[PDB]
Ligand binder design. Structure first.
Ligand SMILES: CC(=O)SCCNC(=O)CCNC(=O)[C@H](O)C(C)(C)COP(=O)(O)OP(=O)(O)OC[C@H]1O[C@@H](n2cnc3c(N)ncnc32)[C@H](O)[C@@H]1OP(=O)(O)O
Ligand SMILES: CC(=O)SCCNC(=O)CCNC(=O)[C@H](O)C(C)(C)COP(=O)(O)OP(=O)(O)OC[C@H]1O[C@@H](n2cnc3c(N)ncnc32)[C@H](O)[C@@H]1OP(=O)(O)O
Lengths: 844, 844
């Protein structure tokens, strides 16, 4: 009935660097729909492309309707299956400490690119567990931090990032594994909390992800293994319908794929059979069962499901809906052509991703205490440095630390200390500097003793914790302590750079360290909602301060720009004393029925630039868009607008272009221009008069009863402008809506454009805001949305109607004319317009 | 201015039950604007009225422009000044535990009523401090609870309630005194937190309150005395401009009054002079200084300000702004007539408030643990009960507790234990039941010993913590433990009621008790936003369960009512398993440019009524209105609409009316009716045909070009209906818009009404939803917004246009006609309408 088809509901691993006979059977006979891989299987880039293609080949020959999913746990920091095949980029708490959702988004994009070229098309990530427990072993630095809002902010960003690169996601571990001291792999963790308690922390990031507007909403959710007595005290969360069906499916109304964590962990293997745990998972409402590692359970589980399917121990109607959800998920990401074609090995962003890693990691480690100003250290060449590193329970992970120390200082001793290590007192007292490397000392007593010992003896001690940042809770006497949030080579490089004062701590602890309350606070800026009643004068002053030379702009024009923005969301940045230091403007517009986010303006005061304020505001902007589902984002705005893209005619502006591309904005190669035209003594050239006379073209306004003819025109020929014409009509600016007609005032509309003139057009028209005496004057105007019908092209009408528009402006007393956002410079050269300012567009 | 005027910026108290020469001097000569009273000054209702009236007269007599403010700390739990002059109603944590914002609002209203009648017109309250510290001596139960969101919720509701009752407020203590173990009256409390930290908890309730839309936004804010080293490490927040101006005035942009806590507290007096401190307070940016007790300081402080005014040590410009803010505030609440009248002491709601006290306190105390099912106790008359209570550091608080037990049991011994108390072991073992009253045992070790002692010896133990609820942290072994949240007499009464099983625990701990993980969790219901894609069928089902008998209503009509709701915010209530058990519907509409909140519908499944679900949904709705500033609230809705008020034709609906009035809704004495009229064979009466023909009145549809004539009519004569007409015009239903014109189809508009007809009117018209075969059926229609110009009344037009309306409807094939929400029954009786259903309206 559904015997072969139920293979799509599974995900299974294997051992080695090429397909086993096991998984070949499962795929070919039992229609297995998803694979999972680990470092065991990741040989190296060439081997993996082959491996993924091999599995894919066998799947197609075996007659699968859709291609396999090939999943992996790529969380990036401490946990990372790529190894040396792919780039080291910051893991979760590292990113949390870094504090930029944009940074995290980019990391996920960079990773998905790498995974997709190798054949991975499903990253089991991100982790949305919240780390409010100092002693959490399993989810330590795998969580972004202690604050559920920070976890949401960063989580959404990565789900976007990964899925933006055509790779599926799984937010985990539902309902929240971050609050326990118990490890899921070893024992059964208990979360003794009610739904009300869960709503306040655990579920915050999950709720926010599920409610995301578009690409930032995850495509699957993973249910970990934890006991929740207030919901189900008999069985673990993955197989309890109170957690899966009642909470995730019913309450939250989640329509996507639900999958389990590995059913071979002791939390479910030592409560029931892993083949039994597979049945109870799908009974609870899971769409999918995970069985990584040991084949035998994979065989059993399959036969367990077949028999249960015969009885009626599985609701056949529910399994159909599950198979439907898995089909939908596959159709979103998978197609046979490019799944088999494979991409070239150089299409991994290896070089670009490498320079991202260097750039990010310099902003990661935190100096937590520095009571004696030991850091930065500036030893003399002949000073003896003792570097003591803890043993690990990857093999010698503190060797990269050692390497990085060597680049700065060679008179160095490197010892890996453990429980057995003979007494090192004498070395500690003799050395001029002692550096100790802890790795979860708060879980490994020998490290705490080592640090406490050295504290008594060392001349100058510094302690770097490279796993969880909580270690100093065990030795608060230590005056100088820092954290790297992960033991990766680049995290150690950055940690050494920090120690030698090459770099400066910019990150902020995403965590509380118990018994350590004098944490060092960097200068912090906070983002509030813009309040026009209170903030307008300051924003006005900021504009003149930054743009006043080339773009002087009075308070009311700024206010017009800002107050008329659709679905607006403007923010300011304030220092600790509430003084405004930066501003960002923002609107959302619908085009083709896609939400479009427009970043209208981003600016910060000169004396406060280069402190991360721009980045704060910028992230607040994209985080808002992200939640709203504004997935197509633009630099500058259409209407209303300060700039259509990024100014190009001064250095500070071009510098701001680099700022934006470096964050991930795709800037255009070519420029875009605003034109200026003198009309002092403008006459319509005779050739055009004669042409328009010969063609029998009529120009003039549209009347209210004729509006439909102008809308009909725009709908057929320039639908992207209809809303602009409609906006003016709402204000009653009919005198600015000029049309060309055939023969006379009753002929069909064959062309049109939008005039504007200072003091004539409605006060809420932002067509021309540059009315300062040093730019365009009082006696100023312009035109826009110029267009001729397709049928009527090549009769000289376009140049006619523009030339007429110039005449009309001259009639109104206009001496200086503004043609905004155009490219055909030779066209407007024929009627006296030379270029005024240039911009480079950007989008995302 | 300016020296006389500065007295308006001061608040001073005094000794006795009549004016001292001291304050008489301050009022008469120094222009003191505000008084503060304490228990010293309150003896009895009669004498307080005489006191407030005397103070008020002297101010009037002495030539004050505006009345004195008369302030008091009336927090209602452990902090009260009224004593027995006013009703005992639940203090803060009692209300947090109770869990209803409507209950907190209703308390404040009752208290502001009692205060005003005595001449007290400023309550220094509510406390928005968040109590996340288990050891907090000041601000224990004075805080609503641990969750800042709960504190905001209740805080807004009380600020509404007090100001609703024409009494001023001061939210306190900015920036948030909830997190310390140090007491402000004794020593300087330190809050070592950054702005970013404070924003997470301390400042949440203050921000929520400051951003409230209308009456729930507070009119003053008090700044406590606490050291914040990250902002200012030299002086306490009261006199630190980094807290007062930079944070409250600039960053939050608050425009109301800022006032200090008492400048006589040791935090201010023992750091710097109390006179000196008043100068620094106004320098920091405070509007108003408090000096509650000592005449010498009140005298000196004034002398310090007069000299400070001379130099220019005070920004004179800033003082004028302050004086204007005080003037603003006084003008909002105070006028000489009411302030000099002494309202009858019958107009204190004493008997009603007594009833409220009883009703609420039954929903207050919580049974926290009851492992042995000791509660409820059922002692035989001859059993011996021993009651041991802690000494206080009032009188003998647990006394009332003693009196309450006596009523249930005669054989009872009562001993107030302390440190000196000789051993009591013998009586404990001998007693059948032992009851121990603790009063912050976690602060007083002798109580912990006493409980530990009894834990082993006593036969059957129950422990009642009557101050802070945290006491069981000191003795988790105790199986049977309850808490009252305050030692007021009715809190104790309710506690005893719970002990003997007369009542049952309905509250939930608003707090976490350390070392007690097994709290008795009652079965709870959580409220989410209504999702129409998931919940429509269930809400439709729920409708049929509850109203299906007399009001059968199809899904699409329910969906129309709900989706067309303006500024909608609908909620559902689920149980732990996500099953929907209740629904509330809501919209906001603007009339006279005030926001009007409309409670469209409130319903819960029958099997789930009487479990607090209606209250949960109800409060969620009122919290939303309160925040939005929708201060005029209605039962039912205008357009769209299920009901215009509460139905009256069945018992369940009449019972639901009681439900609303108990919560404080004002229900009308009279009813309001929907009408039904059979048109099967209707004819226009001959007398009316004549009258119309005689008055030469013309009827017919309004044409699009004539729309302005209809709007002009409605504007001049029925402004409250304009928006409904406009709504129908947007849909294009001109064929339902009938007018009366003078002679002719071109005559002035003199009357109008709105028709509707099933399958003829636009699909989004909700005029008539009752189209079920058993109600009005498919051949159905109606009229609304029937109105004759005031200059044209008594020409039989009203009856003419309505008689015409029936005719037109009959022309359409309508047999049953719906006239909704009317009163003039005899009028519609003349055209064959009898009453169909009746509703009682309700407002707040
Ligand atoms: C569509 C439009 O909005 S167009 C208008 C854009 N505005 C302008 O053209 C002119 C005004 N420009 C500005 O206000 C600013 O220069 C902005 C908005 C472009 C950037 O604001 P800033 O606060 O300087 O940004 P931020 O401080 O995050 O700068 C990031 C860079 O500064 C450096 N930096 C930031 N903080 C630190 C720190 N604590 N220590 C050392 N270096 C730092 C980094 O190198 C970082 O990356 P990059 O050098 O690779 O670019
Ligand atoms: C605009 C319109 O909506 S028109 C109104 C139309 N709606 C209806 O008529 C629907 C029919 N009625 C109902 O659905 C419900 O009865 C409602 C909505 C009126 C009230 O909902 P309920 O859930 O019953 O209210 P709730 O349970 O909060 O309180 C009801 C009573 O039970 C009591 N109660 C609640 N929980 C408990 C408990 N755990 N133990 C003991 N008593 C309790 C309350 O104190 C209250 O007592 P009171 O009668 O002395 O005031």
């Amino acid at each position: 009935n559904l015997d072969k088809e139920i293979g799509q509901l599974l995900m299974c691993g294997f051992d080695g660097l090429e397909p086993t006979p096991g998984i070949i059977d499962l795929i070919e006979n039992h229609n297995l729909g998803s694979i999972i891989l680990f470092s065991r299987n990741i040989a190296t880039p060439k081997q993996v492309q082959k491996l993924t293609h091999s599995l894919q080949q066998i799947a197609r020959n075996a007659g699968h309707k859709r291609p396999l999913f090939i999943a992996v746990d790529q969380e990036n920091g401490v946990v990372r299956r790529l190894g040396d095949s792919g780039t080291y980029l910051p893991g979760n708490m590292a990113l949390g400490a870094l504090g930029s959702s944009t940074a995290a988004r980019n990391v996920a994009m960079a990773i998905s690119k790498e995974l997709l070229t190798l054949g991975m098309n499903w990253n089991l990530a991100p982790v949305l567990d919240v780390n409010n427990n100092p002693l959490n072993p399993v989810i330590g630095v795998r969580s972004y931090g202690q604050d559920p809002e920070l976890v949401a902010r960063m989580g959404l960003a990565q789900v976007e990032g990964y899925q933006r690169g055509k790779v599926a996601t799984s937010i985990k571990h539902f309902p929240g594994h971050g609050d326990t001291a118990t490890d899921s792999h070893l024992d059964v963790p208990v979360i003794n909390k009610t739904l009300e308690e869960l709503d306040k922390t655990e579920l915050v990031p999950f709720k926010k992800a599920l409610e995301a507007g578009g690409i930032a909403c995850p495509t699957s959710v993973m249910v970990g293994h934890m006991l929740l007595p207030h919901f189900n005290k008999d069985v673990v969360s993955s197989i309890a319908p109170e957690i899966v069906r009642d909470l995730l499916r019913r309450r939250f109304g989640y329509k996507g794929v639900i999958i389990t964590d590995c059913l071979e962990m002791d939390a479910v293997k030592e409560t029931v059979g892993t083949p039994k745990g597979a049945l109870m998972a799908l009974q609870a409402g899971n769409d999918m069962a995970m069985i990584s590692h040991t084949l035998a359970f994979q065989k059993d589980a399959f036969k367990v499901l077949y028999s249960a399917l015969q009885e009626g121990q599985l609701d056949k109607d529910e399994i159909r809906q599950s198979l439907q959800r898995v089909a939908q998920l596959k159709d979103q990401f998978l197609n046979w052509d490019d799944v088999l074609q494979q991409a070239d090995l150089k299409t991994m962003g290896s070089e670009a991703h490498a320079t991202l890693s260097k750039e990010l990691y310099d902003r990661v480690p935190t100096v937590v205490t520095n009571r004696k100003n030991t850091l930065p250290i500036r030893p003399a060449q002949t000073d003896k440095i003792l570097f003591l590193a803890a043993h690990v329970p990857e093999k010698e992970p503190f060797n990269s630390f050692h390497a990085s120390l060597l680049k700065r200082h060679t008179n160095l001793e490197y010892i890996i200390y453990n429980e057995e290590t003979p007494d090192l007192s004498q070395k500690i007292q003799e050395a001029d500097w002692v550096i100790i490397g802890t790795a979860n000392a708060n879980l490994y007593p020998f490290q705490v003793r080592m640090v406490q010992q050295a504290q008594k003896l060392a001349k100058r001690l510094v302690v770097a914790a490279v796993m969880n940042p909580y270690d100093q809770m065990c030795f608060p006497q230590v005056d100088t302590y820092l954290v790297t949030y992960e033991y990766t080579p680049p995290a150690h490089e950055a940690a050494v750079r920090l120690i030698f004062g090459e770099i400066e701590t910019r990150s902020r602890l995403p965590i509380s360290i118990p018994n350590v309350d004098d944490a060092i606070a960097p200068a912090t800026f906070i983002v509030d909602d813009y309040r026009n009643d209170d903030d307008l004068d300051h924003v006005t002053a900021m504009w003149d301060d930054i743009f006043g030379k080339d773009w002087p702009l009075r308070k009311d024009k700024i206010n017009l720009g800002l107050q008329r923005a659709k679905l607006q969301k403007h923010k300011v940045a304030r220092d600790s004393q509430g003084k405004i230091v930066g501003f960002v403007a923002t609107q959302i517009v619908v085009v083709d029925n896609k939400k479009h986010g427009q970043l209208m303006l981003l600016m910060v005061s000169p004396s406060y630039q280069g402190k991360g304020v721009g980045t704060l505001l910028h992230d607040a902007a994209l985080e808002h868009f992200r939640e709203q589902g504004a997935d197509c984002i633009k630099l500058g705005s259409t209407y209303p607008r300060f700039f259509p893209g990024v100014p190009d005619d001064d250095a500070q502006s071009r510098k701001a272009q680099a700022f934006f591309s470096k964050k991930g904005w795709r800037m255009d190669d070519n420029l875009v221009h605003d034109l200026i035209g003198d009309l002092q003594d403008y006459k319509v050239p005779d050739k055009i008069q004669a042409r328009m006379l010969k063609e029998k073209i009529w120009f003039g306004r549209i009347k209210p009863s004729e509006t439909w003819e102008l809308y009909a025109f725009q709908q057929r020929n320039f639908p992207h402008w209809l809303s602009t014409y409609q906006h003016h009509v709402e204000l009653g600016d009919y005198q600015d809506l000029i049309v060309a007609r055939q023969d006379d005032e009753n002929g069909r509309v064959i062309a049109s454009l939008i005039l504007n003139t200072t003091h004539v057009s409605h006060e809420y028209r932002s067509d021309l805001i540059w009315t300062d005496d040093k730019l365009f004057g009082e006696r100023s105007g312009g035109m826009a949305c110029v267009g001729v019908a397709q049928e009527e092209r090549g009769r000289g009408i376009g140049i006619g109607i523009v030339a007429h528009a110039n005449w009309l402006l001259k009639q109104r007393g206009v001496t200086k004319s503004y043609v905004d956002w155009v490219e055909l410079l030779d066209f407007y050269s024929r009627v006296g317009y030379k270029t005024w300012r240039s911009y480079r567009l950007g989008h995302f």
